[PDB]
Amino acid sequence: SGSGEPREEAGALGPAWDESQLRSYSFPTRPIPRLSQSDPRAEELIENEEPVVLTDTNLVYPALKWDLEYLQENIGNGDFSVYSASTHKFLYYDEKKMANFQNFKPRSNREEMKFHEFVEKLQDIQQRGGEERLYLQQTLNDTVGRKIVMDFLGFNWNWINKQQGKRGWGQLTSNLLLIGMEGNVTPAHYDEQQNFFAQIKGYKRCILFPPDQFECLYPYPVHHPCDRQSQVDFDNPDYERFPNFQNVVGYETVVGPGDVLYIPMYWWHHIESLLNGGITITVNFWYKGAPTPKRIEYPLKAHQKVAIMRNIEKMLGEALGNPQEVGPLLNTMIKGRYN
Amino acid sequence: SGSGEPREEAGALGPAWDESQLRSYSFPTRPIPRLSQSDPRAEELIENEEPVVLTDTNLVYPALKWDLEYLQENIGNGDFSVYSASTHKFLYYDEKKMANFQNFKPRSNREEMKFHEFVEKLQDIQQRGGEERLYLQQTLNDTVGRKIVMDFLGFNWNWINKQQGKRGWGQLTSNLLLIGMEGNVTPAHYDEQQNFFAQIKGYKRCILFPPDQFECLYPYPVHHPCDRQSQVDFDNPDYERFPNFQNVVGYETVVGPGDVLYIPMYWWHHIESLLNGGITITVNFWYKGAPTPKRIEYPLKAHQKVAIMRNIEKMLGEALGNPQEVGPLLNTMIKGRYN
Numbered sequence: 205s206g207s208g209e210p211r212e213e214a215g216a217l218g219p220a221w222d223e224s225q226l227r228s229y230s231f232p233t234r235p236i237p238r239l240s241q242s243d244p245r246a247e248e249l250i251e252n253e254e255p256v257v258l259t260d261t262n263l264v265y266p267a268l269k270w271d272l273e274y275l276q277e278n279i280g281n282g283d284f285s286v287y288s289a290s291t292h293k294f295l296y297y298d299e300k301k302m303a304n305f306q307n308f309k310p311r312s313n314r315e316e317m318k319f320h321e322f323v324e325k326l327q328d329i330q331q332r333g334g335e336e337r338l339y340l341q342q343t344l345n346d347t348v349g350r351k352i353v354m355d356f357l358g359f360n361w362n363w364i365n366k367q368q369g370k371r372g373w374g375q376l377t378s379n380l381l382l383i384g385m386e387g388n389v390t391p392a393h394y395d396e397q398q399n400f401f402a403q404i405k406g407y408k409r410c411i412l413f414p415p416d417q418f419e420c421l422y423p424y425p426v427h428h429p430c431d432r433q434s435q436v437d438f439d440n441p442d443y444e445r446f447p448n449f450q451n452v453v454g455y456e457t458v459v460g461p462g463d464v465l466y467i468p469m470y471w472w473h474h475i476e477s478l479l480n481g482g483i484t485i486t487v488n489f490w491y492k493g494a495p496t497p498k499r500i501e502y503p504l505k506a507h508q509k510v511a512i513m514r515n516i517e518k519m520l521g522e523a524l525g526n527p528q529e530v531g532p533l534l535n536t537m538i539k540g541r542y543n
Numbered sequence: 544s545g546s547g548e549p550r551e552e553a554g555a556l557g558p559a560w561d562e563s564q565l566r567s568y569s570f571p572t573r574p575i576p577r578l579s580q581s582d583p584r585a586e587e588l589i590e591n592e593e594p595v596v597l598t599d600t601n602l603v604y605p606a607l608k609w610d611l612e613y614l615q616e617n618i619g620n621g622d623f624s625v626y627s628a629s630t631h632k633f634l635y636y637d638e639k640k641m642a643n644f645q646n647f648k649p650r651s652n653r654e655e656m657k658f659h660e661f662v663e664k665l666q667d668i669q670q671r672g673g674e675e676r677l678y679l680q681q682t683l684n685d686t687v688g689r690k691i692v693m694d695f696l697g698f699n700w701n702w703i704n705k706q707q708g709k710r711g712w713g714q715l716t717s718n719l720l721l722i723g724m725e726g727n728v729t730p731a732h733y734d735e736q737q738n739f740f741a742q743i744k745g746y747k748r749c750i751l752f753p754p755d756q757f758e759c760l761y762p763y764p765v766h767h768p769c770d771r772q773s774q775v776d777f778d779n780p781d782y783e784r785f786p787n788f789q790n791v792v793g794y795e796t797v798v799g800p801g802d803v804l805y806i807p808m809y810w811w812h813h814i815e816s817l818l819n820g821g822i823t824i825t826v827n828f829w830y831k832g833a834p835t836p837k838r839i840e841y842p843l844k845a846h847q848k849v850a851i852m853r854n855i856e857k858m859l860g861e862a863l864g865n866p867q868e869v870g871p872l873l874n875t876m877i878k879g880r881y882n
């Protein structure tokens with residue numbers, strides 16, 4: 205199923221989106237349940253760290269009116285982080301980690317600019333028929349226009365705050381504002397925080413994979429710049445290197461204006477902006493997860509095992525004095541002994 | 544080379560031992576240097592944690608006179624740990640670790656007895672032509688006959704103590720008394736302590752492999768009862784499972800009455816009692832190695848890397864709550880990511 209049968213906009217405006225807009229992949233997916241926030245099922249899902257789309261939080265209600273003209277006019281003047289890509293797949297690398305891998309070259313460069321500048325480039329490419337794609341990802345801080353700040357004050361903080369309280373998560377780390385061109389893709393990867401993905405303008409197709417599918421997704425070495433990202437190219441999966449990618453099953457859904465997707469921590473997610481569907485705008489909120497209990501309980505959850513693996517890689521890297529030696533030692537350790 | 548050309552006993556008593564007495568193996572070996580304790584080269588070797596045979600310490604001079612009759616008469620009455628084997632290869636397992644692996648069966652059982660009892664069994668088998676082989680391994684404590692205690696007091700403690708002092712090792716953990724039948728084999732493995740192997744009666748062929756040959760020797764999982772032992776059968780090496788066993792190079796030597804073999808910590812050693820060479824007697828002394836420095840220094844030594852691997856296996860086993868899950872997690876961790 206996945207996104208399944210497209211929702212119909214009220215007033216007979218027709219199907220919000222349709223199939224030809226989604227990209228094609230090798231794996232099967234099932235739908236993430238779209239529920240009402242009042243629905244006890246949703247709170248259960250969140251409590252159990254399973255994804256769910258909430259259709260009625262009103263979380264970013266004030267922002268549903270945002271668009272580029274509005275944002276330009278009222279977002280004020282400040283530098284916005286903007287990324288560029290040669291193709292539809294945006295490549296993110298952690299700059300602090302580049303020292304560890306010399307044979308790494310940036311394929312998706314960051315550029316700091318002013319909203320009007322980013323808007324100019326966007327409009328320009330549209331007219332100039334450029335190959336290029338752009339993505340604006342900027343954390344929001346109190347430097348924004350008065351109107352935007354008022355809009356922010358209008359968010360349903362009461363609801364997001366209650367969620368944080370009930371589940372015992374840590375304080376709200378931050379929120380990021382995301383504006384991207386249609387067809388843009390943020391390749392599968394996972395975060396270690398609990399995320400609330402609130403859609404504002406346009407539709408984004410969100411594909412999630414649970415933590416227990418770690419074997420099928422082949423993340424980069426922890427010391428690699430692309431740590432937490434899948435090495436597998438969903439457009440041309442290499443089965444010889446990533447054999448278990450053939451056993452992967454995603455959870456799929458398409459979020460639109462007013463929807464909030466709870467992405468549990470450690471859950472893989474692949475996100476794409478619908479083809480020919482125009483510009484997209486999202487505001488993502490995230491919380492550090494609740495801290496681990498004193499005496500752990502078995503069976504362990506899959507994400508704890510993932511945490512365990514991450515930790516061994518980090519320590520091994522620190523102990524040897526080089527991250528490059530991690531793989532060789534681990535192989536020496538496994539070969540003919542555990543495999 | 545290895546043992547090379549057999550030493551000649553004084554008074555033209557002829558060759559102490561000869562080739563037909565050594566077992567046949569697939570790998571090449573070179574000789575461990577036999578030096579005088581006065582030789583500065585020996586102290587250098589020991590300082591550098593490289594094996595060496597000292598021909599003149601007089602370490603167990605008083606014991607050179609030991610034999611079974613003498614030991615029976617004077618060793619007093621106490622229980623001695625004695626192991627039995629179906630074949631020439633003695634199998635040692637760590638009993639505390641058996642809970643972790645159910646599909647493990649003892650193939651070399653321990654039996655507590657009295658010296659005269661062990662001597663009886665030995666003599667009996669000799670007459671009865673038994674298939675069986677026996678090995679007496681007992682730590683020595685002040686329960687021994689007065690004569691034996693006097694003999695002990697006669698050891699060149701001054702020399703062994705000076706060795707311990709100069710090198711910064713910890714206190715002498717203990718010493719073990721080893722009496723075995725000719726042809727007996729203690730399969731390759733390593734200890735984490737610094738050992739001084741002092742030969743008393745008979746000849747033992749000692750084959751050592753440095754720590755850096757860990758990949759070629761394939762030790763059992765740390766949680767396995769046979770932890771620290773090579774999984775490879777030197778009599779029938781399985782190259783499909785242990786491919787790098789074909790790259791293994793040992794250091795060889797045959798120790799006789801009066802010789803002391805320094806076996807550095809973490810160094811693999813394979814020890815056999817010469818065929819048809821009669822009974823063997825050895826006293827092994829060991830020290831915990833010097834403690835690790837505050838700020839480590841790179842490059843790391845091979846034994847530190849081995850220590851690192853051991854530690855990761857232990858921790859992983861404790862973290863998961865089962866030692867059986869170690870291998871699966873490590874594979875998940877390596878596959879398509881580091882290999």
Ligand SMILES: CN(C)NC(=O)CCC(=O)O
Binds near residue numbers: 382395399401473475
């Ligand atoms: C932080 N994470 C949940 N958020 C994302 O990955 C957003 C990616 C995007 O929407 O393109």
Ligand SMILES: CN(C)NC(=O)CCC(=O)O
Binds near residue numbers: 728729740806814825
């Ligand atoms: C403790 N280790 C050095 N000693 C041994 O392995 C003795 C084995 C034996 O000589 O059979």
Ligand SMILES: [Zn+2]
Binds near residue numbers: 393394
């Ligand atoms: Zn993410």
Ligand SMILES: [Zn+2]
Binds near residue numbers: 812
């Ligand atoms: Zn040993």
